[PDB]
């Protein structure tokens, strides 16, 4: 009964951390492309 | 079928109307005079509030070797031995539960500090890979 | 409930759900665009009038204020979803407009393809084509990436083509269809593009700055094309977990985007199915077909 | 209180086992890079 | 706080040492007096060891005690034999009604205990997938960010 109540709250916090951790990783992916895209502009 | 105070099999069970639980009349009557409330739920309860219940009565077969002699000597001796050595051993069990409580909460808080210390460690190690 | 909608006198070719999930838009061979209440009693209100050709494709802008309509009369109309008044006519292509897409996010843009083999980029404020990509084979389906930098075009050459707005070059070619591509669509993430083709293959392709280089990410099966040669369109679920594509065998096919198992094969239609759409919030499917009826399946 | 603690203690103990191995993976990754 | 039990199939001795290192860093009357003394000392108070032994030729009283209790005994065995085994087997039936009630509660607890664990299992499998989704995406960036820089 107790294990259910303390666990159920910990998972949102586990996920929400990884969710924000994923958001930052997407930004580095989102910019690194643009520098590659700008290789074609100089050509 | 049992009483919810002593752990008896009651001879005159009576039920309280605030919390449905059967007690033996003598033991519930004593609690109300000590402090007028229901022992389990801590709700307001009086002697008139109780309701006596009826059942087909309880029967104990008095042993074949039953006389005034063993009942005075051997049986009554064993009853006050069994009361004495149990509650003393039960007081020993309550003392260790409080000691083993302290080892639980300390080891728990010790783990909390490890997690807090490792929460700063991990995400900054992941951040360094991002950088 | 299922809910059955009726009213279109001719084949329904396309249907969409309003971005806010309050209304549906549908159109086909009749030349009328009907609006419907998603809830209540599923009532029909405004009829958009003014297309002389048949409506080949509807889209909403991301705001749900503008509804775009490619017609066989070579005109792409822009419609006001609120009043039902026509806004603009993109007169430009020399032949039938087969399909159109409106760029989400960025300043208003529209892409079209037609039987003249060209793909055109429109700024709704100019009343003139901005760029033209002469292909060589008739173009059937076209969509923008989320960055509004690239144009993705599906034709009858079995090869999905990607165009660069700045370089104006054939950037990418995708091989993997054995026959004509009839319907394209981007994932809500920008991550994946969904294609239907005569070869009866549904293929997902992943478009990324950094690409594996042979992006046949997944293949699904079940979806049949036949002698009607109807254009077939496919849609992504709001969350990218489900894939629906219409078929000519009277069944709506819905697959699991990962395991590729058929989640649903749904009947009720009498003829070929032309488009399947997902409600943007709730697991509701609008299936449009040539039997002139729509269903509101709930999952 | 004893039971809920001992369960939650060894439960919270598994947080560390997981955390330690991820922390470790971050080191050789960054080190070798 | 979060540690998935059902999902984590793949350290206790290791984590115990790290938890150990953080621990290296950090109402009755007279009745109760004689009862606690009897239990502590481990000695029961002696009863009347007199009635049983006695001796022929103070003992005139001890003799007369044995008679009255023996007559009470023989009357106390008469009222038992009159009913006999009927009074015993009537109480034996009561003990079977008392027993079965306990094992019904053993089942009710068994069901709700497995029912709580059953709900937890689904939660573990829900998130463990979502964590798997996150890690795959994590590894994709990790190499994607590299392959972007290698080409630049």
XYZ file of C-alpha atoms in Angstrom:
658
model
C 0.000 0.000 0.000
C 2.782 2.429 1.002
C 5.127 1.311 -1.806
C 2.385 2.252 -4.284
C 1.918 5.804 -2.939
C 5.615 6.758 -2.702
C 6.511 5.130 -6.053
C 3.658 6.678 -8.093
C 4.984 10.193 -7.315
C 8.649 9.332 -7.987
C 7.999 8.302 -11.629
C 6.637 11.676 -12.835
C 9.779 13.225 -11.295
C 11.946 10.568 -12.971
C 10.311 11.182 -16.355
C 10.019 14.973 -16.105
C 13.779 15.146 -15.456
C 14.558 12.984 -18.502
C 11.953 14.977 -20.479
C 13.813 18.240 -19.809
C 17.110 16.355 -20.300
C 15.805 15.361 -23.752
C 14.694 18.924 -24.612
C 18.257 20.255 -24.180
C 19.717 17.424 -26.289
C 17.304 18.351 -29.091
C 18.656 21.930 -29.124
C 22.248 20.841 -29.824
C 20.853 18.633 -32.601
C 18.736 21.564 -33.845
C 21.711 23.938 -34.220
C 24.480 21.583 -35.412
C 22.450 21.027 -38.594
C 22.372 24.755 -39.399
C 26.173 25.045 -39.541
C 26.172 22.090 -41.966
C 23.344 23.776 -43.912
C 25.489 26.928 -44.172
C 28.281 24.913 -45.875
C 26.122 24.943 -49.032
C 25.699 28.755 -48.896
C 29.448 29.396 -49.201
C 29.577 27.053 -52.228
C -15.813 -14.106 18.356
C -12.975 -12.443 20.309
C -12.725 -9.270 22.407
C -10.880 -6.259 20.956
C -8.971 -5.332 24.124
C -7.593 -8.343 26.034
C -7.664 -11.001 23.300
C -10.372 -12.999 25.096
C -13.311 -15.090 23.934
C -16.014 -13.015 25.682
C -18.664 -14.333 28.106
C -20.883 -11.251 27.771
C -19.920 -9.468 24.533
C -21.236 -5.914 23.981
C -20.953 -3.812 20.792
C -20.407 -0.040 20.598
C -22.552 1.939 18.137
C -19.885 4.471 17.036
C -17.390 1.809 15.884
C -18.693 -1.693 15.156
C -16.371 -3.748 17.345
C -17.217 -6.383 19.971
C -15.674 -6.021 23.445
C -16.122 -8.012 26.659
C -18.385 -5.950 28.949
C -16.021 -5.682 31.954
C -13.102 -4.428 29.836
C -15.137 -1.843 27.858
C -16.875 -0.686 31.053
C -13.437 -0.060 32.593
C -12.225 2.004 29.603
C -15.282 4.317 29.655
C -14.727 5.122 33.354
C -10.987 5.714 32.798
C -11.623 8.029 29.825
C -15.102 8.246 28.275
C -14.257 7.387 24.652
C -14.070 4.388 22.307
C -10.624 2.706 22.626
C -10.095 1.985 18.893
C -11.555 5.022 17.076
C -11.151 7.565 19.939
C -14.778 8.693 19.467
C -17.188 9.832 22.188
C -18.745 6.794 23.878
C -20.600 6.186 27.167
C -21.839 3.142 29.124
C -25.458 3.696 27.992
C -24.280 3.927 24.345
C -23.187 0.253 24.414
C -25.454 -2.543 23.117
C -25.270 -6.054 24.640
C -25.208 -8.916 22.115
C -26.455 -12.513 22.407
C -24.923 -15.751 21.115
C -25.289 -19.526 21.748
C -22.886 -19.240 24.763
C -19.310 -20.514 25.018
C -18.401 -23.898 26.522
C -15.068 -24.980 28.024
C -14.529 -28.629 28.929
C -13.072 -28.584 32.443
C -10.184 -31.141 32.312
C -10.610 -34.759 33.543
C -8.054 -34.187 36.325
C -9.983 -31.188 37.693
C -10.115 -30.720 41.460
C -9.775 -27.840 43.920
C -6.120 -28.950 44.321
C -4.672 -28.531 40.780
C -6.951 -25.520 40.146
C -5.541 -23.817 43.271
C -1.935 -25.012 42.891
C -0.850 -26.082 39.383
C -3.304 -24.295 37.039
C -3.341 -20.904 38.808
C 0.478 -20.969 39.101
C 0.888 -21.531 35.355
C -1.514 -18.653 34.596
C 0.517 -16.059 36.533
C 3.747 -17.504 35.129
C 2.364 -17.192 31.576
C 1.186 -13.607 32.257
C 4.532 -12.617 33.826
C 7.032 -14.100 31.340
C 4.997 -12.962 28.294
C 4.630 -9.248 29.153
C 8.299 -9.107 30.219
C 9.230 -10.687 26.874
C 6.756 -8.306 25.174
C 8.448 -5.334 26.876
C 11.728 -6.717 25.469
C 10.168 -6.753 21.971
C 8.971 -3.122 22.219
C 12.454 -1.953 23.304
C 14.165 -3.510 20.251
C 11.560 -2.123 17.807
C 12.495 1.416 18.906
C 16.235 0.650 18.588
C 15.712 -0.971 15.176
C 13.594 2.094 14.296
C 16.621 4.353 14.884
C 18.852 2.160 12.676
C 16.166 2.346 9.961
C 15.708 6.138 9.899
C 19.473 6.836 10.103
C 20.247 4.425 7.237
C 17.347 6.014 5.314
C 18.639 9.575 5.759
C 22.130 8.257 4.908
C 20.707 7.053 1.572
C 18.948 10.412 0.964
C 22.314 12.197 1.153
C 23.842 9.720 -1.338
C 21.012 10.366 -3.820
C 21.240 14.153 -3.388
C 25.034 13.891 -3.837
C 24.650 11.678 -6.930
C 21.856 13.867 -8.409
C 24.371 16.736 -8.693
C 26.996 14.303 -10.011
C 25.057 12.565 -12.805
C 23.315 15.497 -14.543
C 26.556 17.531 -14.572
C 28.382 14.540 -16.105
C 25.609 14.346 -18.741
C 25.790 18.130 -19.176
C 29.558 17.882 -19.795
C 28.890 15.434 -22.662
C 26.438 17.985 -24.093
C 29.126 20.690 -23.830
C -20.787 5.477 -30.988
C -19.781 5.195 -34.653
C -21.729 8.187 -36.222
C -22.538 8.176 -39.937
C -22.359 11.363 -41.982
C -24.017 11.882 -45.320
C -24.741 14.751 -47.651
C -22.065 14.878 -50.276
C -23.695 14.024 -53.534
C -20.419 12.840 -55.168
C -17.218 11.046 -54.045
C -15.497 12.469 -51.007
C -11.793 12.866 -51.552
C -10.633 14.562 -48.485
C -11.579 15.459 -45.037
C -9.812 17.122 -42.221
C -10.283 17.913 -38.620
C -10.016 21.477 -37.348
C -6.817 21.983 -35.286
C -8.853 22.628 -32.158
C -10.988 19.496 -32.610
C -14.319 21.386 -32.706
C -15.154 20.885 -36.425
C -14.588 18.816 -39.637
C -14.126 19.873 -43.231
C -14.881 17.661 -46.164
C -15.008 17.916 -49.873
C -14.893 15.969 -53.044
C -16.226 15.549 -56.493
C -19.403 17.620 -55.831
C -17.316 20.749 -55.482
C -18.760 21.701 -52.096
C -16.819 21.991 -48.926
C -18.879 20.997 -45.895
C -18.213 21.917 -42.342
C -19.354 19.693 -39.504
C -19.678 19.860 -35.729
C -17.462 17.203 -34.162
C -19.702 16.965 -31.083
C -23.339 17.940 -30.402
C -25.468 16.087 -32.964
C -22.771 16.218 -35.650
C -24.527 19.014 -37.514
C -23.539 20.488 -40.862
C -23.326 24.295 -41.169
C -21.541 26.260 -43.878
C -21.028 25.139 -47.385
C -18.152 26.706 -49.217
C -19.047 27.561 -52.786
C -16.840 28.711 -55.566
C -14.817 25.785 -56.753
C -15.570 24.909 -60.414
C -13.354 21.834 -60.482
C -13.458 19.026 -57.944
C -11.754 19.473 -54.600
C -8.691 17.320 -54.516
C -7.175 18.386 -51.163
C -8.063 20.310 -48.043
C -5.825 21.518 -45.316
C -6.128 23.760 -42.340
C -3.383 26.169 -41.325
C -2.029 25.528 -37.845
C -4.337 28.174 -36.386
C -7.487 26.779 -37.954
C -8.457 30.130 -39.465
C -7.521 29.389 -43.038
C -8.590 26.422 -45.122
C -6.723 25.607 -48.325
C -8.301 23.863 -51.259
C -6.617 22.494 -54.316
C -9.070 22.034 -57.172
C -8.969 20.408 -60.585
C -9.839 23.799 -62.068
C -6.184 24.784 -61.621
C -7.027 27.156 -58.837
C -6.043 26.874 -55.219
C -8.427 28.683 -53.014
C -7.858 30.074 -49.610
C -10.924 30.009 -47.412
C -11.962 31.699 -44.202
C -12.974 28.969 -41.804
C -15.029 31.396 -39.695
C -17.326 33.004 -42.285
C -16.873 30.796 -45.291
C -15.788 33.634 -47.503
C -13.178 33.108 -50.163
C -9.942 34.958 -49.665
C -7.640 34.257 -52.596
C -7.344 32.331 -55.833
C -3.856 31.110 -56.668
C -4.117 31.068 -60.444
C -0.829 29.800 -61.821
C -0.549 26.176 -62.766
C -1.338 25.305 -66.368
C -3.036 22.073 -65.408
C -4.963 20.357 -62.629
C -3.786 21.090 -59.133
C -3.369 17.704 -57.563
C -2.340 18.838 -54.050
C -1.319 21.624 -51.699
C 0.214 22.220 -48.271
C 0.454 25.261 -46.036
C 3.647 25.912 -44.032
C 3.091 25.833 -40.296
C 4.904 28.307 -38.033
C 6.672 30.491 -40.636
C 5.347 33.470 -42.651
C 2.413 32.325 -44.797
C 3.489 29.877 -47.495
C 1.748 27.395 -49.707
C 3.061 24.673 -51.884
C 1.345 23.070 -54.818
C 1.853 20.363 -57.386
C -0.004 19.699 -60.665
C -0.187 17.688 -63.841
C 2.072 20.199 -65.616
C 5.000 18.562 -63.778
C 5.782 21.609 -61.665
C 5.873 22.452 -58.018
C 5.197 26.007 -56.991
C 5.799 28.033 -53.889
C 3.235 30.611 -53.134
C 3.159 33.591 -50.959
C -0.549 34.241 -50.460
C 0.208 38.024 -50.387
C 1.803 38.231 -53.868
C -0.817 36.788 -56.276
C 2.102 35.230 -58.180
C 4.350 32.158 -58.008
C 7.562 32.608 -56.055
C 9.511 29.567 -57.209
C 8.959 26.892 -59.745
C 10.449 23.428 -59.822
C 9.973 21.770 -63.166
C 10.084 18.054 -62.562
C 9.146 16.238 -65.838
C 6.464 13.878 -64.599
C 3.078 14.885 -63.165
C 3.211 15.707 -59.449
C 0.659 14.194 -57.048
C 1.492 15.093 -53.420
C 3.554 17.772 -51.666
C 4.485 18.789 -48.121
C 6.860 21.123 -46.205
C 9.275 20.167 -43.401
C 8.701 21.916 -40.018
C 11.521 24.347 -40.686
C 9.818 25.555 -43.911
C 13.142 25.081 -45.766
C 12.370 21.993 -47.754
C 9.678 20.807 -50.097
C 8.828 17.156 -50.349
C 7.207 15.993 -53.587
C 5.686 12.695 -54.646
C 4.839 12.057 -58.293
C 4.550 9.231 -60.752
C 8.247 8.514 -60.979
C 8.325 6.313 -57.885
C 10.816 8.683 -56.314
C 10.137 11.122 -53.506
C 12.024 14.296 -54.113
C 13.259 16.915 -51.696
C 13.856 20.479 -52.802
C 16.040 23.166 -51.183
C 14.394 26.638 -51.131
C 17.745 28.465 -51.080
C 19.775 26.390 -53.486
C 16.785 25.449 -55.692
C 18.282 22.043 -56.263
C 17.265 18.458 -56.127
C 18.736 17.816 -52.701
C 17.383 14.351 -52.017
C 15.998 11.409 -53.856
C 14.263 8.547 -52.133
C 14.088 5.192 -53.871
C 11.904 2.428 -52.492
C 8.591 2.810 -54.252
C 8.003 0.561 -57.214
C 5.116 2.714 -58.445
C 3.372 6.120 -58.282
C 3.178 7.949 -54.977
C -0.233 9.291 -54.199
C -0.018 10.747 -50.714
C 2.576 12.302 -48.430
C 2.513 13.575 -44.854
C 4.963 14.780 -42.167
C 4.990 13.626 -38.537
C 4.052 16.374 -36.048
C 7.703 16.289 -34.910
C 9.153 16.853 -38.344
C 10.893 13.605 -37.858
C 9.140 11.262 -40.346
C 7.303 11.386 -43.685
C 4.590 8.932 -44.605
C 3.909 7.716 -48.115
C 1.251 5.730 -50.073
C 1.849 4.258 -53.486
C 0.278 2.088 -56.111
C 2.713 -0.731 -55.282
C 0.529 -1.245 -52.140
C 3.373 -0.318 -49.882
C 3.088 2.168 -47.053
C 6.584 3.479 -46.322
C 7.875 5.743 -43.561
C 10.929 7.845 -44.397
C 12.990 9.805 -41.825
C 14.255 13.254 -42.732
C 17.006 14.675 -40.529
C 20.073 16.868 -40.817
C 22.074 13.731 -40.002
C 20.583 10.833 -41.963
C 21.390 7.118 -42.129
C 21.531 7.676 -45.879
C 19.057 4.882 -46.720
C 15.981 6.081 -44.940
C 13.493 3.186 -45.525
C 12.776 3.325 -41.850
C 9.755 1.014 -41.928
C 7.357 -0.684 -44.298
C 3.703 -1.562 -43.717
C 1.318 -3.702 -45.591
C -2.410 -4.292 -46.110
C -3.267 -1.316 -48.229
C -4.643 -2.160 -51.691
C -4.905 0.048 -54.868
C -6.945 -1.018 -57.927
C -8.464 -0.046 -61.284
C -10.081 3.087 -59.904
C -6.601 4.737 -59.647
C -7.857 7.064 -56.945
C -5.372 9.253 -55.161
C -4.745 7.736 -51.731
C -3.755 9.780 -48.686
C -2.391 8.849 -45.323
C -2.234 10.537 -41.962
C -0.265 10.542 -38.731
C -1.930 10.392 -35.372
C -1.567 13.588 -33.254
C 1.106 11.846 -31.148
C 2.849 9.975 -33.994
C 2.008 6.569 -32.498
C -0.539 5.478 -35.158
C -0.589 5.401 -38.924
C -3.667 5.406 -40.987
C -3.939 5.015 -44.693
C -6.988 4.508 -46.877
C -7.323 1.779 -49.438
C -9.445 0.692 -52.298
C -10.600 -2.497 -50.583
C -13.139 -0.824 -48.363
C -11.043 -1.104 -45.267
C -9.465 1.576 -43.160
C -6.108 0.417 -42.137
C -4.491 1.600 -38.900
C -1.073 0.366 -37.896
C 1.227 0.576 -34.873
C 4.048 2.953 -35.929
C 6.601 0.682 -34.109
C 5.670 -3.009 -34.211
C 3.840 -2.467 -37.522
C 0.934 -4.671 -36.438
C -2.465 -3.864 -37.891
C -4.404 -2.343 -35.068
C -7.565 -1.785 -37.052
C -9.011 -2.963 -40.277
C -12.390 -1.279 -40.377
C -15.375 -1.824 -42.599
C -18.654 -0.051 -43.132
C -17.655 1.517 -46.466
C -19.060 0.212 -49.652
C -16.447 1.604 -52.046
C -12.859 2.795 -52.061
C -11.501 4.946 -49.206
C -9.759 8.105 -50.099
C -8.634 9.685 -46.824
C -8.355 8.909 -43.158
C -7.952 11.559 -40.472
C -7.293 11.572 -36.747
C -8.888 13.926 -34.299
C -6.171 16.118 -32.787
C -6.987 15.390 -29.109
C -9.018 12.178 -28.793
C -8.672 8.741 -30.537
C -11.318 9.472 -33.163
C -10.988 8.579 -36.815
C -12.757 10.247 -39.717
C -12.830 7.990 -42.709
C -13.769 9.442 -46.099
C -14.599 7.401 -49.094
C -16.020 7.238 -52.505
C -19.264 5.907 -51.157
C -20.104 9.496 -50.113
C -20.347 8.746 -46.457
C -18.085 9.441 -43.509
C -17.597 7.521 -40.289
C -16.432 8.843 -36.904
C -14.765 5.750 -35.433
C -13.712 5.932 -31.817
C -10.793 3.912 -30.509
C 7.146 2.159 10.576
C 9.892 -0.507 10.664
C 8.431 -2.383 7.686
C 7.696 0.718 5.570
C 11.237 1.978 6.259
C 13.148 -1.254 5.507
C 11.190 -1.695 2.253
C 11.667 1.969 1.256
C 15.334 1.813 2.364
C 16.283 -1.084 0.072
C 14.044 0.577 -2.542
C 15.980 3.838 -2.177
C 19.156 1.686 -2.153
C 18.409 0.542 -5.724
C 18.330 4.225 -6.755
C 22.058 4.346 -5.929
C 22.939 1.138 -7.815
C 21.308 2.625 -10.926
C 22.782 6.091 -10.324
C 26.334 4.775 -9.780
C 26.485 2.832 -13.061
C 25.220 5.816 -15.105
C 27.672 8.183 -13.416
C 30.372 5.617 -14.278
C 29.266 5.486 -17.940
C 29.569 9.293 -18.166
C 33.241 9.100 -17.116
C 34.708 6.676 -19.695
C 32.536 8.260 -22.400
C 33.851 11.782 -21.748
C 37.361 10.488 -20.946
C 37.701 8.557 -24.216
C 36.206 11.494 -26.160
C 13.196 8.090 -4.823
C 12.321 6.181 -8.028
C 13.676 2.627 -8.342
C 11.769 0.193 -10.574
C 11.549 -3.300 -9.002
C 9.613 -5.257 -11.672
C 11.434 -3.697 -14.629
C 15.008 -3.772 -13.281
C 15.936 -7.405 -13.970
C 19.707 -6.700 -14.018
C 25.046 -4.184 -6.478
C 23.267 -4.569 -3.119
C 26.664 -5.243 -1.497
C 28.118 -2.239 -3.349
C 25.287 0.162 -2.456
C 25.306 -1.119 1.149
C 28.938 0.030 1.468
C 28.106 3.530 0.135
C 25.149 3.765 2.574
C 27.496 2.466 5.311
C 30.069 5.197 4.544
C 27.370 7.891 4.920
C 26.527 6.322 8.303
C 30.232 6.394 9.280
C 29.941 10.156 8.629
C 26.730 10.740 10.641
C 0.995 2.060 34.440
C -0.180 -0.369 37.150
C -0.014 -0.623 40.963
C 2.065 -3.044 43.120
C 1.039 -5.815 40.666
C 3.616 -4.618 38.097
C 6.549 -4.569 40.564
C 6.285 -8.228 41.639
C 5.328 -9.409 38.123
C 8.372 -7.773 36.487
C 10.574 -9.074 39.333
C 9.225 -12.628 38.892
C 9.913 -12.541 35.132
C 13.364 -10.918 35.475
C 14.543 -13.324 38.200
C 12.971 -16.299 36.357
C 11.334 -17.695 39.515
C 7.665 -18.555 40.130
C 6.263 -18.018 43.645
C 5.875 -21.302 45.559
C 2.356 -22.665 46.156
C 0.929 -24.899 48.920
C 2.925 -28.145 48.661
C 1.141 -29.694 51.659
C -2.201 -31.336 50.791
C -0.729 -34.152 48.665
C 1.848 -35.684 51.036
C 0.693 -35.457 54.717
C 1.303 -38.270 57.261
C -0.669 -40.691 59.536
C -0.176 -40.630 63.339
C -1.661 -30.167 62.691
C -2.085 -33.350 60.608
C -5.628 -33.800 62.003
C -6.451 -30.637 60.044
C -4.389 -31.761 57.006
C -6.267 -35.084 57.051
C -9.703 -33.404 57.260
C -8.656 -31.190 54.314
C -8.015 -34.260 52.127
C -11.516 -35.671 52.817
C -13.583 -32.582 51.910
C -11.581 -31.913 48.733
C -11.800 -35.633 47.804
C -15.591 -35.512 48.253
C -15.698 -32.288 46.223
C -13.446 -34.065 43.686
C -15.732 -37.106 43.390
C -18.724 -34.761 43.001
C -16.696 -32.708 40.469
C -16.095 -35.892 38.414
C -19.781 -36.932 38.579
C -21.186 -33.826 36.833
C -18.492 -34.185 34.124
C -19.255 -37.849 33.366
C -23.031 -37.181 33.343
C -22.664 -35.055 30.202
C -19.409 -36.804 29.292
C -18.148 -36.310 25.737
C -21.194 -34.280 24.579
C -19.993 -31.152 26.406
C -16.479 -31.583 24.936
C -17.469 -32.139 21.290
C -19.893 -29.187 21.510
C -16.877 -26.938 22.243
C -14.866 -28.697 19.504
C -17.475 -27.495 16.969
C -17.090 -23.893 18.186
C -13.322 -24.091 17.590
C -13.905 -25.015 13.920
C -16.139 -21.945 13.393
C -13.410 -19.825 15.025
C -10.633 -21.269 12.830
C -12.259 -20.927 9.391
C -12.912 -17.209 10.025
C -9.151 -16.518 10.335
C -8.294 -18.222 7.022
C -11.014 -16.210 5.227
C -9.155 -13.072 6.320
C -5.894 -14.678 5.127
C -7.503 -14.824 1.665
C -8.950 -11.269 1.781
C -5.485 -9.942 2.659
C -3.890 -12.212 0.024
C -6.153 -10.799 -2.722
C -5.717 -7.103 -1.888
C -1.939 -7.590 -1.463
C -1.602 -9.158 -4.928
C -4.034 -6.521 -6.262
C -1.793 -3.640 -5.128
C 1.297 -5.305 -6.666
C -0.734 -5.880 -9.850
C -1.326 -2.114 -10.255
C 2.361 -1.347 -9.598
C 3.439 -3.801 -12.321
C 1.651 -1.854 -15.081
C 3.182 1.431 -13.885
C 6.692 -0.100 -13.943
C 6.196 -1.363 -17.509
C 4.677 1.957 -18.645
C 7.601 4.128 -17.570
C 10.392 1.589 -18.206
C 9.386 1.852 -21.860
C 9.389 5.666 -21.694
C 12.888 5.549 -20.148
C 13.924 3.187 -22.964
C 12.539 5.727 -25.460
C 14.527 8.516 -23.783
C 17.836 6.599 -23.798
C 17.530 5.700 -27.494
C 16.978 9.388 -28.303
C 19.861 10.266 -25.970
C 22.303 8.021 -27.873
C 21.079 9.404 -31.205
C 21.967 13.001 -30.299
C 25.267 11.879 -28.765
C 26.447 10.545 -32.138
C 24.458 13.079 -34.212
C 26.212 16.042 -32.568
C 29.559 14.377 -33.384
C 28.790 13.626 -37.046
C 27.699 17.269 -37.497
C 31.055 18.526 -36.133
C 33.180 15.961 -38.020
C 31.883 17.279 -41.362
C 32.076 21.008 -40.544
